[PDB]
């Protein structure tokens, strides 16, 4: 809807910064770890395929978690509750048909009650001061796709895959803003399937050159290289289906030429 491409993009670029969570946030959280975070996000991924939600809801949910765990020290028993409650929130925000709450109790395998989920819902809401309309790695990729010469579901798919991979890894990717992570991905995903690269009309639109991307780009590449060997695979299995053109089986480049 080119009438407001830029006008939206710009707004968004400015919103991330606002809805950006605190980098080493896990370092002050006394009873959880970047490690357990992943077990957490990795699961949500899995929840997302079962209940047939949107990629958006993942990215939204992850981010509510990150933001929230940026302010409330939560204990082990409860990380899962926080994460269920945010899934629910991203649901209510973004799906036409949000899963219901009992369905969300069910996927935690009756850990918490109904009340509890709903009670956290609120806290998350209060703590987030109702600011749930976040930009996501998804949002930007979606937009960047439009500058695709020409479009190619594989590249689109891989782009996603990658992008999503970063949800799991609190370090570094908590370092990067979604617009970059999405920059880091789309390129990576291009060069791989078509050996092209960050198209110049996105240098112009986002003002991010190859160079500026590099530090995201390097990390993103590792993370891609080592994806068959990471502790959490739920994403990887996901981008095995035809839905996503089998991209997780594509074999990444072995050197980024950067």
């Amino acid at each position: 809807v080119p009438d407001y491409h830029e006008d939206i993009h710009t707004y968004l670029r400015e919103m991330e910064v606002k809805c950006k969570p605190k980098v080493g946030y896990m370092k002050k959280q006394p009873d959880i770890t970047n490690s357990m975070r992943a077990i957490l996000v990795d699961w949500l991924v899995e929840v997302g395929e079962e209940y047939k939600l949107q990629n958006e809801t993942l990215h939204l949910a992850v981010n509510y978690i990150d933001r929230f765990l940026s302010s409330m020290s939560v204990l082990r028993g409860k990380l899962q509750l926080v994460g269920t409650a945010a899934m629910l929130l991203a649901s209510k925000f973004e799906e036409i048909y949000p899963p219901e709450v009992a369905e969300f109790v069910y996927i935690t395998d009756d850990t918490y009650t109904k009340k509890q989920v709903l009670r956290m819902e609120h806290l998350v809401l209060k703590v987030l001061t109702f600011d749930l309309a976040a930009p996501t790695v998804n949002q930007f990729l979606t937009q960047y796709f439009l500058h695709q010469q020409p479009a190619n579901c594989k590249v689109e798919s891989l782009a996603m895959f990658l992008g999503e991979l970063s949800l799991i890894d609190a370090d570094p990717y908590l370092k990067y803003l979604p617009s970059v992570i999405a920059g880091a991905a789309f390129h990576l995903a291009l060069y791989t399937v078509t050996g092209q690269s960050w198209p110049e009309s996105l240098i112009r639109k986002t003002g991010y050159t190859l160079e500026s991307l590099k530090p995201c780009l390097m990390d993103l590449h590792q993370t891609y290289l080592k994806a068959p060997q990471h502790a959490q695979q739920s994403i990887r299995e996901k981008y095995k289906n035809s839905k996503y053109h089998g991209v997780s089986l594509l074999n990444p480049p072995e050197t980024l030429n950067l």
Partner: peptide, 10 residues
């Protein structure tokens, strides 16, 4: 059809 699960010590 199998994603329910209890992630940690509660």
């Amino acid at each position: 059809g199998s994603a329910k699960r209890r992630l940690f010590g509660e």
